[PDB]
């Protein structure tokens, strides 16, 4: 029907650093359960993409996830959550709420 | 302005690949470009983010600079053109179809 994109921050910083990063919450392992996900449904393969990116300033709340067009963004997500996200939002179209932690804009900006 | 969120593949592969990369089209320089715009003009910072990424799968027409939740697609972008991006599209709001290779979708999708 519609495409969405999807942007997995795989950020990585030292171990005992400030802020902590996405990489060190698991991200890259959010990032490849995305991948294998699409590339499983012929119809998701056709009108959705993942793209690893850089930090996107919400750390504390990583991994994040940003879905566009939608603007939805989603925090601490793991591996097992991938799956719920895919069905009842990249597919169903609604997003999954108890990970949500900003729309239409990133957290923290007015 | 409104807000707009600026992606701008930074990916980089060895000399020997045989599809190259943004990052070999000078793709950083556009990226470093963008952020010398978002700290040298008063009000873009307000409704602007520009993230860098890895490949979003376009490599042949790089570098590439996606422009959401617009969805517009540049391609072939150098550091000279980010200034007629941010004015004419990220405030005034209207593409620089010069350099539009898609919208609402990827390229050849
Ligand atoms: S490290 Fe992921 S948002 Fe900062
Ligand atoms: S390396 Fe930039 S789009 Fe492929």
């Given at each position: ?6 942007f997995v921050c795989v950020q990585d910083r ?6 902590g990063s996405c990489a060190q919450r698991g ?74 932690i900003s729309k239409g804009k990133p957290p923290?900006?007015?």
């Amino acid at each position: 029907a519609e495409f969405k994109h999807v942007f997995v921050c795989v950020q990585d910083r030292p171990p005992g650093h400030p802020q902590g990063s996405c990489a060190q919450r698991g991200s890259r392992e959010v990032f490849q359960a995305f991948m294998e996900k699409i590339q499983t449904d012929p119809q998701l393969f056709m009108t959705t993409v993942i793209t690893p990116t850089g930090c996107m300033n919400a750390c504390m709340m990583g991994p994040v996830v940003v879905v566009y067009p939608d603007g939805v963004w989603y925090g601490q997500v793991k591996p097992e959550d991938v799956d719920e996200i895919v069905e009842k939002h990249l597919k169903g179209g609604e997003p999954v709420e108890r990970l949500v932690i900003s729309k239409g804009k990133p957290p923290g900006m007015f």
